[PDB]
């Protein structure tokens, strides 16, 4: 146990009384609205989102990085830190690794995971930066690089990622690359894409029967003129070309200004190519901010699309949900804890939507009541539900408060040497 059980216990008790009042008040209110709060809590307590191994360390920009105390020394420290997130929120049972950063004996990763009660989610390849000994630089691209040998080196790396995942329990490989151009003319848009498709078809051949290959679009950064996998359109073209095992990943902050992201999710779902969602928030570009911190309503509107799919009865729909954020000015663990919470919060509120009444207002083109029906769920403070979900599953009524009372950060700060 990363966090002393007696600490969690003391902290949960101190708030039990206040929780009981708010929850029961919310229960009565929901009952008046025809909603059984227990059924909502039952679903919330089982909603999981993956945590990125690389999100537990302090992030930075190209201008600087301001690390905090007790920064994780390697993958094992990161897993230890992810264990804290899961223990307190019970919403992040799985960890998503990034190779080569997390490269290590699979036997040992698995054992650490099992020992911590953590599982492993989608693997993540890295051909957007050069590693030591690398025979070919990824400066001008990787999977779509004009140099065949360079593309072969990227393919092999993705295949290795799969092998590693096969040994630890992972069932998918996420592929995000920087490939693109910074100057008009530097790249032949069409040929660069074909090279990419060619390299991806090879990675696809290495997929086990029950694995999936996720391609992730991004409007820009690191490329500032054009990007091979720039949007969901090109993303869909990829998944449809590769095969049943290939699907699209939608990362919130990877879209052009004012883009209607919730629609893209719907479109993808409609054609069964929504492989998963990468949560975070933003205001300007791919800011990778804590989910819900900037536009909480948009987060709820993304989930509205997710829940409506289930309501419509879409078949074999098990999206892979992962958090992909950067924490440049907060305790990484704390931001992940509250981000995971916002996600559960948006999900919970989406469950509160009266689809029946909604279905009616849409039919009569009653735009105002349709929107109001959505707002009634969104405006509901579901915090009590989230808190109760944690209590029942061994988590903390107030995760961050409990995290701070345990003095965890100071503990690891004294154990881990800064570099």
Nearer to its own copies, 39 or 131 (CB): 131
String of contacts with Cu ion for each residue 249-288, x by CB under 5 A: --x--------------------------x-------x--
Beta strands in 265-403 (DSSP E): 274-279, 320-323
- CB of 209 vs its own copies, minimal distance in Å: 27
Nearer to its own copies, 173 or 248 (CB): 248
Three-class secondary structure of residue 121 per DSSP = coil
In this structure, what token pair is assigned to residue 230? 């720039």
Q: Which does 188 bind (CB under 5 to 8 A by kind): Cu ion, its own copies, none?
A: its own copies
At 32, which helix (H) or strand (E)? helix 5-32
Cis peptide before 222 (omega within 30 of 0): yes
Question: Is 194 annotated as belonging to a binding site?
Answer: no
Question: Is 286 annotated as belonging to a binding site?
Answer: yes
Q: Which does 210 bind (CB under 5 to 8 A by kind): Cu ion, its own copies, none?
A: none
Question: Is 38 annotated as belonging to a binding site?
Answer: no
A 10 A CB-CB count for 295 gives: 16
- CB of 373 vs its own copies, minimal distance in Å: 6
Q: Which does 361 bind (CB under 5 to 8 A by kind): Cu ion, its own copies, none?
A: its own copies
Only one of the segments 144-152, 153-161, 239-247, 323-331 lies at the binding site for Cu ion (rule: CB under 5 A); that segment is 323-331
Contact 248, 217 (CB under 8 A): yes
At 175, which helix (H) or strand (E)? strand 172-175
Nearest CA to 343 out of 280, 258, 274, 250 is that of 280
- CB of 217 vs Cu ion, minimal distance in Å: 10
Can you tell me the distance from the alpha carbon of 217 to that of 175, in angstroms, rounded to the nearest whole number?
9
Q: Which of 324, 334, 342, 398 binds Cu ion (CB under 5 A)?
A: 324
In this structure, what token pair is assigned to residue 179? 């490939």
Nearest CA to 322 out of 176, 160, 121, 180 is that of 121
Question: Is 216 annotated as belonging to a binding site?
Answer: yes
Q: Which does 5 bind (CB under 5 to 8 A by kind): Cu ion, its own copies, none?
A: none
- CB of 261 vs Cu ion, minimal distance in Å: 13
Q: Which does 278 bind (CB under 5 to 8 A by kind): its own copies, Cu ion, none?
A: Cu ion
Contact 57, 71 (CB under 8 A): yes
DSSP letters, 51-65, are EEGGGSSPPB-SS-B
Backbone angles phi, psi at 98, to 5 degrees: -130, 120
Q: Which does 264 bind (CB under 5 to 8 A by kind): its own copies, Cu ion, none?
A: its own copies
Question: Is 217 annotated as belonging to a binding site?
Answer: no
Question: Is 398 annotated as belonging to a binding site?
Answer: no
Question: Is 251 annotated as belonging to a binding site?
Answer: yes
Question: Is 342 annotated as belonging to a binding site?
Answer: no
Q: Which does 167 bind (CB under 5 to 8 A by kind): Cu ion, its own copies, none?
A: none
A 10 A CB-CB count for 305 gives: 20
Can you tell me the distance from the alpha carbon of 135 to that of 150, in angstroms, rounded to the nearest whole number?
8
Q: Which does 258 bind (CB under 5 to 8 A by kind): its own copies, Cu ion, none?
A: its own copies
Contact 50, 321 (CB under 8 A): yes
Nearer to its own copies, 207 or 337 (CB): 337
Nearer to its own copies, 379 or 411 (CB): 379
- CB of 311 vs its own copies, minimal distance in Å: 10
In this structure, what token pair is assigned to residue 133? 């000994």
- CB of 37 vs its own copies, minimal distance in Å: 13
- CB of 88 vs its own copies, minimal distance in Å: 14
Can you tell me the distance from the alpha carbon of 145 to that of 136, in angstroms, rounded to the nearest whole number?
10
Please enumerate in sequence order all residues whose Cβ is within 8 A of that of 379, keeping only pairs 6 or more positions apart, or say none: none
Q: What is the binding site for Cu ion (CB under 5 A)? A: 251, 278, 286, 324
Q: Binding-site residues, please?
A: 216, 251, 254, 278, 286, 288, 295, 324
């Amino acid at each position: 146990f990363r966090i002393a059980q007696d600490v969690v216990a003391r902290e949960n008790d101190r708030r039990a009384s206040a929780l009981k009042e708010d929850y029961e008040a919310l229960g009565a209110n929901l009952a008046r609205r025809g909603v059984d709060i227990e059924a909502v809590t039952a679903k919330v307590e089982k909603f999981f989102v993956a945590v990125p191994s690389w999100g537990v360390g302090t992030g930075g920009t190209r201008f600087a990085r301001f690390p905090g105390t007790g920064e994780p020394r390697g993958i094992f420290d990161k897993l230890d830190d992810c264990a804290v997130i899961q223990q307190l929120t019970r919403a992040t049972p799985n960890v998503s690794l990034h190779i080569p950063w997390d490269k290590a004996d699979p036997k040992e990763l698995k054992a650490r995971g099992d020992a911590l009660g953590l599982g492993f989610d989608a693997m993540n390849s890295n051909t957007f930066s050069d590693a030591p000994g690398q025979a070919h630089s990824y400066k001008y691209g990787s999977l779509s690089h004009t140099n065949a040998a360079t593309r072969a080196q990227a393919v092999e790396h993705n295949l290795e990622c799969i092998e590693i995942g096969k040994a630890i329990g992972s069932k998918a490989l996420t592929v995000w690359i920087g490939d693109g151009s910074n100057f008009p003319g530097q790249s032949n848009f069409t040929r660069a894409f074909e090279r990419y498709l060619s390299a991806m078809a090879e990675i696809y051949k290495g997929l086990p029967d029950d694995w999936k290959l996720f391609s992730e679009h991004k409007m820009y950064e690191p490329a500032f003129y054009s990007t091979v996998v720039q949007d969901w359109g090109t993303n869909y073209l990829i998944a449809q070309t590769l095969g049943p095992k290939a699907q699209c990943l939608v990362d919130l902050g990877h879209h052009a200004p004012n883009t209607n992201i919730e629609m893209i999710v719907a479109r993808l779902i409609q054609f069964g190519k929504l492989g998963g969602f990468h949560f975070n928030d933003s205001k300007y570009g791919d800011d990778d901010l804590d989910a819900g911190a900037i536009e909480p309503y948009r987060l709820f509107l993304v989930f509205n699309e997710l829940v409506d799919a289930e309501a419509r009865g879409v078949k074999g729909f098990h999206p892979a949900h992962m958090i992909d954020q950067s924490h440049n000015v907060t305790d990484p663990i704390e931001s992940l804890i509250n981000s995971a919470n916002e996600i559960r919060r948006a999900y919970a509120q989406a469950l509160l939507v009266d689809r029946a009444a909604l279905s009616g207002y849409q039919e009569d083109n009653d735009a105002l009541m349709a929107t109001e029906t959505l707002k009634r769920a969104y405006r509901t403070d579901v915090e009590p539900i989230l808190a109760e979900a944690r209590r029942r599953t061994g988590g903390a009524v107030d995760p961050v408060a409990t995290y701070r009372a345990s003095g965890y950060r100071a503990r690891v700060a004294a154990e881990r040497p800064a570099s």
